[PDB]
Amino acid sequence: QLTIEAVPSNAAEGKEVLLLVHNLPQDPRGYNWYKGETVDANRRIIGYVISNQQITPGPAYSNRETIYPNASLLMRNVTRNDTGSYTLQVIKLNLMSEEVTGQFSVHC
Template structure:
């Protein structure tokens, strides 16, 4: 990097003559930007950072060069000038103490502010006193989050959005799994065979279920036919083995209740 800008010296008469010659040649030779170019690195620079204005396609037979703030050559907007033969750098009226001119004609501006946004013009002076000019520019922006670059902030926002999407997808998956599991359990419960008591036969479709403790149940009275014979005991007549002679009368009662319904 070049030497810091030194305060101007009144005894530097040759340099003042070079500036006068460059000013006169500006009117005699229209500036061209066909060969000389200025590149800003970076173009968008955060406030408080530094930016480098780099010159490209410099001629070999140069005497010196001058940096100006703005889109044209203006002595009042001169940042500084550099003489190649003596390696002497002189600050100008627009110098703020943050600018450094390097030996390769580049201009370094440190700790940039919003007021530094704009164009900067480089004027080079050749040995034949022919001048050539080129203009570059950059933009200064204020960082969104102090201490964090814009890329880091964008990465954090993207990560949060991705995390929210994953959580939402997981919740939906769990709800669907729970709903499916409940439906399967319900289907299995409906398909489960009926538990029967000992000695009870499974009911076929259309057969009434087994009466509960308070449901109506049929009872039957048995009457003995006239052709049955045999002694009678204390419990009543002995039933003959001829079952076809039995007459059944259907009676309904409520189990667990003392009331007996009429015979059907």
């Protein structure tokens, strides 16, 4: 199954968390990351379209986030307010999709 690992899962304030994604499906078209536990356009952090490497900052972007291809999300410069859930939607080539969440915490 599709999975997310916050590296580290408990991070000191001002450092960085990487959300690693395991078991991506084989046929991805692109990805969106969301703040919270569900897919909601109003809480979209960032996305990526593989065919043209288009990055798509959304309303929850804070100028700290980087989406790689593989779907991994790097958030630099974390604050106590970044503690919470993060949800990935992977849109496949056939436009079917998969969702996974997504947690980390931040101290100091």
